[PDB]
Amino acid sequence: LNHGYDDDNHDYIVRSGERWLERYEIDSLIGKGSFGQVVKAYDHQTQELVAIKIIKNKKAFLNQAQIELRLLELMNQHDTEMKYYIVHLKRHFMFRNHLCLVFELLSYNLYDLLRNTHFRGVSLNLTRKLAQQLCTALLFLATPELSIIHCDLKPENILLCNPKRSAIKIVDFGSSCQLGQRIYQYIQSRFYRSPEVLLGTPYDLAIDMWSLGCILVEMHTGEPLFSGSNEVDQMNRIVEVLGIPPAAMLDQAPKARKYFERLPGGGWTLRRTKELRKDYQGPGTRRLQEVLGVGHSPADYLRFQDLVLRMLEYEPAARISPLGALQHGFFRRT
Numbered sequence: 555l556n557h558g559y560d561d562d563n564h565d566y567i568v569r570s571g572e573r574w575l576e577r578y579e580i581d582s583l584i585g586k587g588s589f590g591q592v593v594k595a596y597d598h599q600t601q602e603l604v605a606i607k608i609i610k611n612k613k614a615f616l617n618q619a620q621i622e623l624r625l626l627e628l629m630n631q632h633d634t635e636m637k638y639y640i641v642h643l644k645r646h647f648m649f650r651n652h653l654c655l656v657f658e659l660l661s662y663n664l665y666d667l668l669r670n671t672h673f674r675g676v677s678l679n680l681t682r683k684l685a686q687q688l689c690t691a692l693l694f695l696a697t698p699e700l701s702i703i704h705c706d707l708k709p710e711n712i713l714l715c716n717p718k719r720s721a722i723k724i725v726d727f728g729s730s731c732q733l734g735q736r737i738y739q740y741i742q743s744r745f746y747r748s749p750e751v752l753l754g755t756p757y758d759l760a761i762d763m764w765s766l767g768c769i770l771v772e773m774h775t776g777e778p779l780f781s782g783s784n785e786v787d788q789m790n791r792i793v794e795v796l797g798i799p800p801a802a803m804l805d806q807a808p809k810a811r812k813y814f815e816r817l818p819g820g821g822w823t824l825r826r827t828k829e830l831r832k833d834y835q836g837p838g839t840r841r842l843q844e845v846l847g848v849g850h851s852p853a854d855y856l857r858f859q860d861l862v863l864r865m866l867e868y869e870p871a872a873r874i875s876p877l878g879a880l881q882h883g884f885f886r887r888t
């Protein structure tokens with residue numbers, strides 16, 4: 555607790571109506587997370603609402619947000635069209651021992667959109683609109699000069715610009731890194747965590763595409779595709795849909811043995827611990843066709859499933875690229 559401004563988690567104690575810097579009036583809490591808090595604030599100088607991300611008062615979180623700041627400014631440097639899929643940082647300042655990042659205020663997040671459907675999912679047409687924008691934001695991050703791995707793609711970090719419009723932007727580069735410059739082994743939110751991160755292998759921009767494949771299914775069905783309770787359970791649920799990962803991946807995977815075991819002359823198989831639910835039927839027995847259930851032709855559903863399976867390829871080299879996804883027949887008349 556610093557002068558009484560911080561709670562026990564080193565989060566700033568948000569008080570509605572408080573005035574900061576004789577400029578910002580705090581209205582309400584938007585969200586909490588590992589990083590800290592996001593608040594809705596009124597900028598009295600410009601007479602506009604903003605969102606303010608208040609980083610936790612910890613050396614570690616302060617240090618990690620230096621990176622997030624640098625990456626946000628990098629993504630704003632040039633006059634590109636693609637950069638407008640990113641919520642852009644208006645400014646940053648220090649306030650009572652907290653680094654504060656000011657963003658344009660958006661309306662709500664993709665989890666809110668799903669809850670408004672009673673978690674039944676959105677139409678295939680809206681899933682398509684959202685997916686093509688998300689693929690484009692990934693194409694942008696893959697630009698060589700950026701080479702940014704978002705590392706925390708998930709519904710909470712995908713915001714709708716306007717309540718009656720399907721435009722989206724992405725937020726939360728607080729765990730992002732650039733290619734090769736990976737600096738954490740336990741990354742991504744668990745439901746959206748890729749096999750290579752689960753397996754401890756070197757990861758690259760493809761981990762975001764894995765997340766995106768998970769998200770598109772959730773958008774359509776209303777529910778997370780792989781809602782694991784821990785990493786072993788996360789692997790188990792992935793394997794139940796997509797089968798055993800390829801031997802070339804498991805052979806070079808430091809944590810292969812956390813989930814899998816070797817059969818003499820039988821390759822790799824899932825370790826059968828008590829973490830496995832009793833009704834578990836085997837690898838690939840929860841077909842994606844049945845998860846999806848029974849612009850909306852049955853051919854459109856088959857194209858959607860095809861795109862999702864290319865996003866959920868185990869081998870990152872084999873997983874569809876942002877450009878490949880954009881050229882996929884799910885989106886394109888040709």
Ligand SMILES: COc1cc(N2CCN(C)CC2)ccc1Nc1nccc(-c2cn(C)c3cnccc23)n1
Pocket residue numbers: 584585592594605607641657658659660661662663666710711713725726727
């Ligand atoms: C009223 O505005 C919002 C309301 C909500 N909520 C979410 C809960 N439901 C129940 C209500 C609606 C969610 C987002 C917004 N707006 C908004 N606009 C800009 C940035 C951010 C932002 C969110 N996150 C996780 C971030 C992480 N890093 C940086 C920036 C952000 N959020």
Ligand SMILES: [Mn+2]
Pocket residue numbers: 627646
């Ligand atoms: Mn700056």
Ligand SMILES: [Mn+2]
Pocket residue numbers: 587588589706726728729
């Ligand atoms: Mn995050």
Ligand SMILES: [Mn+2]
Pocket residue numbers: 673674675774775776777847
């Ligand atoms: Mn459903």
